[PDB]
Design a protein around this ligand. Structure first.
Ligand SMILES: Nc1ncnc2c1ncn2[C@@H]1O[C@H](COP(=O)(O)OP(=O)(O)OP(=O)(O)O)[C@@H](O)[C@H]1O
Ligand SMILES: Nc1ncnc2c1ncn2[C@@H]1O[C@H](COP(=O)(O)OP(=O)(O)OP(=O)(O)O)[C@@H](O)[C@H]1O
Ligand SMILES: [Mg+2]
Ligand SMILES: [Mg+2]
Lengths: 455, 93, 98, 87, 107, 95, 88, 107, 93, 455
DNA sequence: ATCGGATGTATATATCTGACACGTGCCTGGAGACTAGGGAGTAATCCCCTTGGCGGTTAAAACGCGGGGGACAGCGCGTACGTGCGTTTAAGCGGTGCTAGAGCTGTCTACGACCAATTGAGCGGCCTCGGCACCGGGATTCTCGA
DNA sequence: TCGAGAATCCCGGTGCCGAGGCCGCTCAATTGGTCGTAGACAGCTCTAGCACCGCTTAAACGCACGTACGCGCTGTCCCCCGCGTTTTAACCGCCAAGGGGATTACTCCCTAGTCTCCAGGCACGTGTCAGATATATACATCCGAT
């Protein structure tokens, strides 16, 4: 069939050969009338192949049509700018903003069919579902596919109601927790083909009798390209675990929690995690009032006490830092710390407004990049955004799900890095953090050691 | 496991009273609560009547007396009418 | 000049529209936090069912609405229209709960 | 110092002035003296204290650790305010 | 022989056998006469019928065809017999009766 | 002559200090019998039964007058009036 | 004619105005509106009707013909007004 | 062997055996534990002691050596906790608590 | 026929509390009826608790819980202390 | 011993021989230290023997002393006047009147011991008991002894508390209902001697084995003189029973009562008695309002309808009438009837004040006796008073106890009558009145046919 | 503001007196011993439902300001009610007669419990469709300045 | 006064979801005998409620007077309502972990049922003392002339 030998003429820029192979894969799927998962690793231009394939469907098979692209909120500007850079000839816009503006946009453009590509976030989709359900979509494109890993999630349900000629999924981390997630994704891709949960489960029941069958069943539905066997031009990542103890305040509060010491303690896990991260997250442990930010912050927190030394050092080495955390409040603590330390942060979080997010990213990726450290959270700003300017990623606290950390560390070690990436994960000795690290390791091995080793 | 309630019986009564209306789930929970409440009131009063009179048996006449004591005004007369009607018909067959 | 209602009209409109409806009137999250804080003083570290908290809110609003009806009648009896703490106190005194 | 934003200074204050006004309006009240809100909060707190005490007693007796709808219903019925629609 | 339900024999729609069991396991008395269940079943059936017709009328006046707690509350609180019977009962989602004191109405 | 009110306080003190019944036995008994005739003709009574009725009735009326006085004072008065009685009964929930 | 001297024109009027004043004085009342006595008589009569109805119900359930102190006591306890000092 | 009353073993004055019989003959539950009568008798004895002590004090304040319903009423209505316990209870020949509203008293 | 009351026991308690005071007969009847009233309250509450928890036995735990529910304030704690003391001593002997 | 042959010198007037015998009997009892019952028949001067015996105890044994004479209220003036007529030398007064006057009299005379004879009614005795109990009485004299026939009667109890040297009883009708009354009286007379109820009962258990023993036991304790064997000079009474039916109103109301026809009917006996006497005693049966007294009264009452004929007739014969009744209201009806009939009544009843009673009796016994008919009641004015002026006694309605009728009919047929006495008892045919008449006859035969036949 | 004199009230005293505390005989109900059985405590399992925090959205709450109308004080004016006096009438206690009615006793006997077998009715599970909730759009109505 | 004008009501249209209808268990209700005891019945007896009257006496009833209290009117002011702006905290959905509730199986120990004594509680006399009454006396107090 149409094998699409060389780089597209209509697509600007030159794409590397494996990108052409992926585009060919997509075209094959489109003609065969099957939909698959572009599960390529983090960092490679998955957006670029997607745009190329849309350019195919517009300029070869001549179907501009309605195109729906769903993505995390932070990456909507990224998609818009990229589609305006590679094929600046398609009608594309972001369906975001106030509900008044959203309804206005619907009435003008969405109901006027004056569009080709629509970019929307999950919340808008689940919100603006009635008008979108009135369009016979050709392709529905979901970035960050592991978001629908639960089939009862109302995003999953709503997506299972749109009129779609065909579907297509992107995710850098396809397998998250167990097998059932894959069935969840595929039931969205090919509902008729699978339509079976227990049959899928018992066809394998979690040697060679299964894992080989595992590969065989999904060989045509998935495509992965590891960065080691495909790019290689990239210096590899350097990870590190900085084992630390606890300070006096930390130790005291840790026991106080342990022997149950009028405040509500129901999930002991999160209380211990707060303790290990920073005891000031507990109310009142900070001396005062008056509340002053001079220096009592750093020394009574083993995490931050080590952090100050390491950050200052790297400042003399003159590199750039990314800080990921699980908690917005700890992020506030860190921000106050830099305010004391006279650094130039560029904090992003789940409460940050859209254009503020755009402005922050553009600030940190500026030429000469006035900013030093950039404050993040693993969920909100830990997907898709392209902070290649920095070179040192610091995971303040580990996550219960390793792939959420893989995405975070790969937000800097992606194409066009041209540096050495050093990832400094902080752990606390003799604490639950060790346990969460262990469980994350088992969940991650259940993944890498089995499914995607050949890929 | 299995929870028993008066749902189907209240539904039958409704389909005899208004053969064309419906009742939502919260409302039928409310009817279930009402039925259990009034049942327990009548039964408790009948029990203590039998205790006062040193009987050891709950009979239709204690049920009748407890009904007259609980239900007010016009309710009591019609309720007793309906109950005597039912027991008469029952003992005929 | 801008349009303004008399100081007593919007009150009547609110009365009509709130006696017409059936939903809850206190915000669910603040009520839940209050319940948990109170309940902590009898036994520490209790769990609640969502239906338990909802039952408590139903009963609480019912009680307060009845109390405000009694307060209003007392205030009218005193030949006012503004209800006051003395009216609440009298109403609860007559009901034998203070 | 962004870590020191604020606290809602109590949970009883979460029963806001507008919410009390809505309860009063449902009751049928037209004007509300400005001091009504404070003893309204007091009254509500007392009522909740009684009912929750009773329900926690029931839960302790059953050797459970979760208060349930049925425990609350029993507490109300015991205090003399039967509640229909929860079991 | 062929079983006939006591509810059938008395021509009832409430379960005589179930009511009899509830009486007997409720610790109300040492013994239970045979007509007590029939009488009690008939009485509960009657009371339910009354509240139901009232609530159905209340719904119909709202151009609606499913009963809801609002309708139940209106039905109960609008007549004196049932209001007196359920004088100390809270009905969830019931609302209140529309009522404004006359002195508050504008002159 | 005493000024109006002094004897009222004096008799308040006397009657709150005492304990006996305040309605006459025969009037109350006749009233009870007449009321009872409307539920079942030809009833007999026990003297203790009529005394029980009188105890309960007097207690009830004393409580009602206490609440009535509270209402009248609330309305900024000292004279109790039928509207005060009606308000007390309505709030108590006897209407 | 000495036959037609007089009747008390009711029994409810046997609850004399002085007696009602005395009950009010025990209740703590100082000054009494002249209209009070009729409402007091009405209130009392209603109260008695409720209690006596219940007591007679108890009596004739027991198949007796004499209203007893215990019938009255149960009637009051039913009403929600327990009475101490008459048996039970 | 010589007999010992359950009341004596528990060192009470209220009778455990009678309370046990009343529990079992009152249709409260199918079976009655062994310590229920003891525990209940202890509680009733305590409450009676409390009321009696208060009423005896009230009598002694009147230079009286016999409790009468008036003294019982005074004790109960002046102890706020017992008053809460017996809120809905009428004591024959009890009288009322001396109470005059402040507004009435002369200036 | 024989009628049983709490007279002799109430008298014993009185002679332990006030060793030199008497009680007239009307007050004695009042105390007898008070004792019966509170007994019936506690027993009924224990019965309902045992029914709720699907048990078929009234034990010191149910009586204790019913006392907590009925008696308010300091009376609850004092009464429970008295009762547990008595049951402890009873079991020890 | 002192046999007291002839008429007392100190006593005025001449007393007939059997009176001397009775006085001798009393003196014998006094010396023997036993007390007995002067049970002489109605009409003979029992008062006269009593006064004579007191004159004995004052002028022979020289003991003025305290003397207490208890009597029905109506006869107190009679006793006072008689003691002032026969022996006008003794300190005697009536302890009667308002409680203020009574206390005044006590303080002046009773506590001053300035008295010899005290006359009091039953109610005063039971009322004024504390001051009277402080006198060591010599003789306590009870007229109309059958008044204490019940030993639980508080009069009986109180009399059993006075300090009495000796007792003495008078009654014209000693045996009323059964045997126990005699034991009741004798236990007052000789408490130590008898002191036994069941022993008295079973010593006889109610032929000859008993009635002879009955006579023997009481021979010294009793003295009776029938008028036939002693007076031999009085005209004998003429009794008559005027059987009547019922009028329309009477018949109607009689059924209405029979089949239970919102008014209270508990003792059917008294309701029927009211019906038979006069239906107007029922409220509302009288036509009206307006209420007029012209003639509808007489014809619709068979009793009164017969009465009018008989009374009018006897008016032309020109005799005088006594009317006894059981009910004060029926007495009012009769009074209104005479008001219509323009007769001159002199009504007496239980509500009539003392001096009004005296004035009424003196009016009816006046010379030329302006009054025609005299209205009575069997209980109040049916004892002791001396209406010898009249000659026709009419018993409107029979009594449950015959002796109450014997006293009533004997209030006119007593000494110094000098006429023929005609007693007209009215009965209603086919009514309960027949039954009460029958029971009274059995009670009366149980008396006359057994006990006092020899006396 | 302060005495003077009534006037009600509290107190001490002697006297019944009647209600209470005590002593006796009986029976009936509680304690002891023993057996048998079933309720509940215990341990294991698992799964489900609670808890905590974050992410995004957005509607309600908090603050502030202008102004009018509702509460409160003050004053005058009937007017209704408290206080005091003389009469009699109705209540209270007792005495009588009486008889219906309520409570005890002994006998069956009809009815309700107990048990075993079987079946059908009711519960939980699984489907669709119609009743209702937005929702825009015009009509009507009522309010506030004229 | 009548002309804006904001709120409210219908009202047709759309979708949406919660109601209604159908399909397998399983367990609990019905049938059929068999017992045994709760109560219904008849008879007896004695007691206590009913009705009236007699007699006493204290409270209720009618009347007059004057005062202080409730009620209406006026004025002031201030406090609460109505309205606009901003932001923040509620709401709902995600996402993990894991505590805790609910079932099942085992068995044991605690309660019931029975029979046998016996002693404690009840009914019934009986002496007696705490208290209510009456009397006199002292005292606090209130309302009217200086
Ligand atoms: N042909 C190309 N030439 C230069 N740069 C490229 C090319 N293709 C991709 N990139 C780089 O890819 C980056 C954009 O992110 P990218 O599209 O790789 O995200 P992704 O891994 O495709 O998808 P996700 O959003 O899931 O990370 C840009 O920084 C751009 O430099
Ligand atoms: N010695 C006498 N001389 C004249 N008349 C006498 C004499 N004795 C008695 N009487 C008459 O007795 C009448 C007084 O009544 P009396 O004393 O006979 O009543 P009683 O029968 O004695 O007692 P009761 O009062 O029970 O009838 C007077 O009319 C008087 O004439
Ligand atoms: Mg990308
Ligand atoms: Mg004479």
């Amino acid at each position: 069939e149409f094998q699409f030998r060389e780089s597209p003429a209509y697509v600007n820029g030159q794409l590397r050969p494996y990108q052409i192979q992926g585009v060919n894969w997509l075209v094959s799927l489109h003609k065969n009338k099957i939909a698959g998962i572009l599960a390529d690793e983090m960092g490679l231009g998955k957006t670029l192949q997607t745009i190329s394939f849309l350019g195919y469907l517009r300029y070869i098979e001549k179907i501009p049509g309605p195109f729906l692209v769903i993505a995390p909120k932070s990456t909507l500007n990224n998609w818009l700018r990229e589609i305006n850079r590679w094929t600046p000839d398609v009608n594309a816009f972001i369906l975001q903003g106030d509900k008044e503006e959203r309804a206005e946009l619907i009435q003008k453009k969405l109901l006027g069919c004056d569009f080709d590509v629509v970019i929307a976030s999950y919340e808008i989709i689940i919100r603006e579902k009635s008008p979108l359900k009135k369009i016979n979509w050709e392709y529905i494109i979901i970035d960050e596919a592991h978001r629908i890993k639960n089939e009862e999630s109302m995003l999953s349900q709503v997506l299972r109601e749109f009129t779609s000629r065909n579907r297509l999924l992107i995710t850098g981390t396809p397998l998250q927790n167990n097998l059932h997630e894959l069935w969840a994704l595929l039931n969205f891709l090919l509902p008729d083909i699978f339509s079976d949960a227990q049959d899928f489960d018992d066809w394998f029941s979690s040697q060679d009798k299964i894992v080989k069958q595992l590969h065989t069943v999904l060989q045509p539905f998935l495509l992965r390209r590891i960065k080691s066997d495909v790019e290689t031009s990239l210096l590899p990542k350097k990870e590190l675990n900085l084992y630390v103890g606890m300070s006096s305040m930390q130790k005291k509060w840790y026991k106080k929690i342990l022997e149950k010491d009028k405040t509500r303690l129901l999930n002991i896990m999160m209380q211990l995690r707060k303790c290990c991260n920073h005891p000031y997250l507990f109310d009142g442990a900070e001396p005062g009032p008056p509340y002053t930010t001079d220096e009592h912050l750093v020394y009574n927190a083993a995490k931050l006490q080590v952090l100050d030394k390491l950050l200052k050092k790297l400042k003399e080495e003159g590199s750039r830092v990314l800080i990921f955390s699980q908690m917005s409040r700890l992020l506030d603590i860190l921000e106050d710390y830099c305010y004391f330390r006279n650094y130039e942060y560029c904090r992003i979080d789940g409460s940050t407004a859209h254009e503020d997010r755009i402005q922050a990213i553009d600030d940190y990726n500026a030429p000469d990049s006035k900013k030093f450290v950039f404050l993040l959270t693993t969920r909100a700003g830990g997907l898709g955004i392209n902070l290649t300017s920095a070179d040192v990623v610091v995971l303040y606290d580990s996550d219960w799900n390793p792939q959420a950390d893989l995405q975070a560390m790969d937000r800097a070690h992606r194409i066009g890095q041209k540096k050495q990436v050093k990832v400094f994960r902080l752990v606390t000795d003799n604490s639950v953090e060790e346990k969460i690290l262990e469980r994350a390791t088992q969940k991650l091995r259940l993944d890498q050691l089995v499914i995607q080793q050949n890929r | 496991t299995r929870k028993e309630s008066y749902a189907i019986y209240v539904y039958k009564v409704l389909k005899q009273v208004h053969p064309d209306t419906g009742i939502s789930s919260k409302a039928m929970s409310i009817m279930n609560s009402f039925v259990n409440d009034v049942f327990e009131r009548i039964a408790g009063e009948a029990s203590r009547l039998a205790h006062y009179n040193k009987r050891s048996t709950i009979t239709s006449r204690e049920i009748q007396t407890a009904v007259r004591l609980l239900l007010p005004g016009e309710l009591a007369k019609h309720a007793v009418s309906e109950g005597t009607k039912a027991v008469t018909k029952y003992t005929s067959a | 000049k801008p349009h303004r209602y008399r100081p007593g009209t919007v009150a009547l409109r609110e009365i009509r529209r709130y006696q017409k409806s059936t939903e809850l009137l206190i915000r669910k999250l603040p009520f839940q936090r209050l319940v948990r804080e109170i309940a902590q003083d009898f036994k520490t570290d209790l769990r609640f069912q969502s239906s338990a908290v909802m039952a408590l809110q139903e009963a609480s609003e019912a009680y307060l609405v009845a109390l405000f009806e009694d307060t209003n009648l007392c205030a009218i009896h005193a030949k006012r229209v503004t209800i006051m703490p003395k009216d609440i106190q009298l109403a609860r005194r007559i009901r034998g709960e203070r | 110092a962004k870590r020191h934003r604020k606290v809602l200074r109590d949970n009883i204050q979460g029963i806001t002035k507008p919410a009390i006004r809505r309860l009063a309006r449902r009751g049928g009240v037209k004007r509300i003296s400005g001091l009504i809100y404070e003893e309204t909060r007091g009254v509500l707190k007392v009522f909740l204290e009684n009912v929750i005490r009773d329900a926690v007693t029931y839960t302790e007796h059953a050797k459970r650790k979760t208060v349930t709808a049925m425990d609350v219903v029993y507490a109300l019925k015991r205090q003399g305010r039967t509640l229909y629609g929860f079991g | 022989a062929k079983a006939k339900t006591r509810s059938s024999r008395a021509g009832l729609q409430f379960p005589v056998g179930r009511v009899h069991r509830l009486l007997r396991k409720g610790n109300y008395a040492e013994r239970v006469g045979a007509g007590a269940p029939v009488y009690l079943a008939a009485v509960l059936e009657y009371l339910t019928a009354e509240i139901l017709e009232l609530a159905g009328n209340a719904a119909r006046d709202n151009k609606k065809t499913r009963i809801i707690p609002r309708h139940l509350q209106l039905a109960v609180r609008n007549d004196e017999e049932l209001n007196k019977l359920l004088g100390r009962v809270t009905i969830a989602q019931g609302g209140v009766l529309p009522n404004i004191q006359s002195v508050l109405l504008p002159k």
